[PDB]
Amino acid sequence: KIRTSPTFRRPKTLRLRRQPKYPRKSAPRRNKLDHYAIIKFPLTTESAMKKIEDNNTLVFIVDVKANKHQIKQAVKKLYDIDVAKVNTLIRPDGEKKAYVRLAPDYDALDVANKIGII
Amino acid sequence: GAYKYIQELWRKKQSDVMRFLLRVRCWQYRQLSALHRAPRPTRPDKARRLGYKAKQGYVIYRIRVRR
Amino acid sequence: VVNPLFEKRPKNFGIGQDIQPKRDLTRFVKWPRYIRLQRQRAILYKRLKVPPAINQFTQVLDRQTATQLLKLAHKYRPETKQEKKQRLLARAEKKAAKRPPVLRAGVNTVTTLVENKKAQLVVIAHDVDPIELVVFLPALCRKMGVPYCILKGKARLGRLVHRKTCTTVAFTQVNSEDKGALAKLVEAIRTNYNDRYDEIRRHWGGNVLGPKSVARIAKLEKAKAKELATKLG
Amino acid sequence: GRVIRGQRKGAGSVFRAHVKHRKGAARLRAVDFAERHGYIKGIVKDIIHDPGRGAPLAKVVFRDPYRFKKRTELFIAAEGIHTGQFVYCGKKAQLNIGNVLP
RNA sequence: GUUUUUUCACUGACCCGGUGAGGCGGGGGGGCGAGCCGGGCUCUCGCUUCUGGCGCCAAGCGCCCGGCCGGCCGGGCGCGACC
């Protein structure tokens, strides 16, 4: 073996992987951002009733740490309805408002009737 | 015992052998960093007199300060 | 037979002609600090005037006597951790229904038995990293009349014992069939080490310039000597 | 008294050099085997103006004798140097304008 | 005979510069001139100057081994690139 370059580099040694004899915590933590904890309550305001009636959407107050994907898959499990799109904003109250547009074959006010807002 | 010989050997620092050894060791430690781990005690009888026991958990660090 | 499409294409490796081939450059590697430090520590022992008490360890037993010495020392190795337990078992079934001579190790043991006239031959490693551990011991062997020898390798001296390194190993008592084999070694070691200790104490080491620095002065003295060799006729 | 203006220049941070639009440190080519035992040939690409400097600079391109690369250096332009001119370097280089040799 | 100090040198402590720490010092091999009568020596160079081109990841030679039918197919080593 010849030294082709005049630079000595550190040779790459074998790096083993972590094989601990005990887990550092006993149990994995429970997912506190549950599908019930992520959607708190909808708005029954007159600005949200026109939003429900005209644009075939629903308006929710969601958790502030929620993605649009999480809001989508949370509505799809609690209310058994698929989602066209989710548009979120953060209010000056501090709460996150979510406009959730349903599919064209599902009707948002007939979803709102069975959940309670009318 | 050899430790008594090494002890009286280190008291003759003006001799030729010790002035050779001290100079080459001072040159060697001057080329290293300001603080680094020694793998073993350099002066074992004196480390032993100060309380070093050659067993696991006893660590020797060599260090230089500016005069 | 030959194909006319197989040309011979030489590369002219001159200055500015072609890109240089990927040559061996081990002389011009920028080495790490520990490699450079140990390498120019090895040069300082050739440059600086080494005092004779440290220089005497460079004077070493030769290639053929060392093999005979280790061949003798292989018959007196101390027991391992397995034969230690097996002897305790054998003592138990001896109790149910003399010390053999072995090698003795450690500089603190060897110094004490050389002082007490128990040792018959001492083997001292040449590469002890603090040399204060054994730099007094050739004088202690010579004054008490104990034959001492210097051997290549505290590692190889540490293979007689079942450890990593051993510094000094003393033959104190040997078997009757190996007494002649020991006395054969003792004569050759005494005529090389103990008898010539007056010259060992006066042999300074090092004080040798580098090859590049001695070729320069050799050429200069060659010019100054060929001046006399040519101007006389 | 107050620290004087000539004293305040060594601290820096106001009196530092304006080196934002400068083109680089103008220097000779580093010495190697070619420039120590023979000569190497390069080409003047362009002549540029370095800010804060009355002398012009010449960007000379050589080729590396050990790697397949083109090396760029900023020489200080001797008067009479034009672009497309070959600049030679080393002990065996001939004696012309714009031609470095020991 | 100790020691005082002045100069000429050495490098190895110490300092500076350069670089991707890339051909450093001796020796060997090859070529041109002085000279002795094919052989040892004083010397030098070892390959690039008319041009705004291109230039790496080996050609060639020798040595081996490996699967398919001396012939297909594919590897490694040395010289090439002196010690």
Short mmCIF file of C-alpha atoms in Angstrom, two decimals, chain B residues 34 63-67:
data_model
loop_
_atom_site.label_atom_id
_atom_site.label_comp_id
_atom_site.label_asym_id
_atom_site.label_seq_id
_atom_site.Cartn_x
_atom_site.Cartn_y
_atom_site.Cartn_z
CA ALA B 34 -2.00 22.33 27.83
CA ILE B 63 -0.93 19.59 32.83
CA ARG B 64 1.20 22.66 32.14
CA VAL B 65 0.87 26.20 33.49
CA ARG B 66 2.65 29.41 32.53
CA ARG B 67 5.34 30.68 34.88
#
